[PDB]
Amino acid sequence: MDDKELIEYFKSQMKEDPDMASAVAAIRTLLEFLKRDKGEQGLRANLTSAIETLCGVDSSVAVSSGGELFLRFISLAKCKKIMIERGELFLRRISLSRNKIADLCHTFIKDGATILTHAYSRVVLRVLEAAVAAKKRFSVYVTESQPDLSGKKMAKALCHLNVPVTVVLDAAVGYIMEKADLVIVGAEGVVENGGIINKIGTNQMAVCAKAQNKPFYVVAESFKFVRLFPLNQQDVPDKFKYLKEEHPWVDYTAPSLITLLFTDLGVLTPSAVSDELIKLYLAA
């Protein structure tokens, strides 16, 4: 394919199917890029990563961690061009992640709990559905999440499952925290120290949850494990972030503010991520 097609293909993956994660949408356009791309050799390896950056259209961290993991595990090899069969394999495997997670979580959501969440998260929606429809009664609190009000969107989705839900202002997280039992949040990216990059506002929610001793749980797919090691907001690359005005789309939450992470790799405490991440990136 060519740049044009690439983006057009990518954008038309999440638009007709928002259900899908950007990361997953990125490797799909990448399978087609590869497939639809014929005629090489290292040209393939280079022309493929030289366009994976192009999918940067989505400043999403997952596009970056996803692309690498996908790329790394198909490069192991025009007969060698059977990397495609590994791509279908990989895309076939990552499309089971949400589920392993919603399963590793049915236990922590106890009957009668009050969950506090931030913005929209597909994985979070899944976990709660697999809990409600799974004979559990709870209520949720979610921040409206400026600037795209994705929190309201989340709310509506929760209402459709007839789960009691209240929307509050981002400014009201420390106000509503005392009436929460636990907070569940998704991640755009899990960094090498067990911390996470997520929709701006995630950080302060964690700081408040900790001061009130409320467990903070993160629910996210392993293909979100990215090779970055930030220690503060300043370390997060601008590339993922975007009288004066500052509009960071995401922020970083240190691992000490996280209780547990639920991944298709199993439930992990922040200090276990680094070893998993490597034991993940290095797989044949």
Added chain:
Amino acid sequence: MDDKELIEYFKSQMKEDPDMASAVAAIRTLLEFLKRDKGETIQGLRANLTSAIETLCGVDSSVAVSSGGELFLRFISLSKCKKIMIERGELFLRRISLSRNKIADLCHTFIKDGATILTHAYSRVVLRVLEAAVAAKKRFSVYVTESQPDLSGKKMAKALCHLNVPVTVVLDAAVGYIMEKADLVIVGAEGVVENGGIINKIGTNQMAVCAKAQNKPFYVVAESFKFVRLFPLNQQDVPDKFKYKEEHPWVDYTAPSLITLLFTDLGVLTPSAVSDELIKLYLAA
């Protein structure tokens, strides 16, 4: 060779060459055990037996021997023609043999002329760094802790004396007292942990904490084969198999936040960027 035999070989390996890091002696006996070992039907069966002695080389309970050992076994891994593991094993040793000196020179920039350097115990890697610096004709002074219970800092003071370098031996209880007189501290590591922190001879943690409070840079010098797959966040998370032999642990742990920079054979690194090197390391396969 067997256990009794392995240990014998491993000890004499270091007796004959005291200047040799315990981690290199261990991997050398593993190579020797690789050659000397035969009787296949172990295509991957002895890939276990060679581990059944990775442990045995616990006659020296240092993390180095472990992270190094795992590196070796990881590197020499790809028909009994497979004893190409041996020649790979010889390539590896050949490789991790230019580490000390490479670090020594890839580190001369930071040894200012006229400086007062405070170090702890004995580290052959720190010794090569200063030797390099002296040959480079830099004039500096050194303070070293005797480092109980084996007093290995005194052996270090002698080595520096026979190098005509001004060195003063102090009590371990004296690091707080002497800190103000130093420009920087330079220490070695038995193991570099996944978060950029390190495991080193007991006493290291204190020095790092005392150096932080007076803003004296804290530098670590260590070979890459010491990058170990561990992520401790406190003394408790360090395994006892690396501590013993309270009851007198031989090593304490120093958080990354107490480390200014690490000078490795892969170059100078900030503690935070270390975990990525471990991946980049193994990616070398």
